[PDB]
Amino acid sequence: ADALGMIEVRGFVGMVEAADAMVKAAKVELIGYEKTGGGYVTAVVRGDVAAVKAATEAGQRAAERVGEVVAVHVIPRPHVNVDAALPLGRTP
Template sequence: MASVEAADAMVKAAKVTLVGKEKIGGGYVTVLVRGDVGAVKAATDAGAAAAERIGEVISVHVIARPHSDVEAILPVSQT
């Protein structure tokens, strides 16, 4: 449920695209968003705060300007 709250807060806080969520095992869920670096930072801050109110946030990470090799494996490649 915390991942849903985080996703909702992120798309409401900044102009980002919700790419999706992945269950990565052990009860952990990753929520992925894309957008400009500043917007993604604002969104992840809001998402982390929302998730903390319900559960535990293990990590938040923003990849600014991913290398093209990394870009190729990320969901919803931007063209």
């Protein structure tokens, strides 16, 4: 449906400063956070591609001052099998 934005930080503190700087920078929807174990947490924001591209680049710009930022990526179109299989806030 909507576009997709992700910051993955080894550490909970850097993910929150990521997840705080994203929802201030644009009109996005912080839907949750995925705990894959081992200290990795992934903030998932969601909205149109104008917002979540200019939000996660402000998420990465703030989370590189407190945490070891693992991976930053924007998916403008998650495919319809992705949103039904992976927990990305749009489970039908």
